[PDB]
């Protein structure tokens, strides 16, 4: 209840998936967008 409000806490963020598994005690600060397809992403809803 300490970390709960009726408005809600949407600041908390997580990475659903990554290119490779993280090593123990390793911190990743990059917000890179995964190049699933050969085409560039550019932060659009394009090819995967």
């Amino acid at each position: 209840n300490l970390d709960s409000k009726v408005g809600g806490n949407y600041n908390y963020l997580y990475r659903l998936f990554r290119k490779s598994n993280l090593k123990p005690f390793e911190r990743d600060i990059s917000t890179e967008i995964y190049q699933a397809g050969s085409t560039p992403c550019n932060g659009v809803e394009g090819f995967n």
Binding site: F25, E26, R27
Partner: protein
């Protein structure tokens, strides 16, 4: 660069030649250890011009 650390070993010894490293034996005692929490793949030194 292991376990999120950076171990430094140092040793000072005078030299009397100008060619290359001498034919000697010397150990490197630890001097300091401080943590880095990011993987490192490349590096470059700095020189006084």
């Amino acid at each position: 660069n292991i376990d999120g650390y950076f171990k430094i070993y140092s040793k000072h010894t005078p030299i009397n030649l100008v060619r290359d490293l001498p034919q000697g034996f010397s150990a490197l005692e630890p001097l300091v250890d401080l943590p880095i929490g990011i993987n490192i793949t490349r590096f470059q030194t700095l020189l006084a011009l």
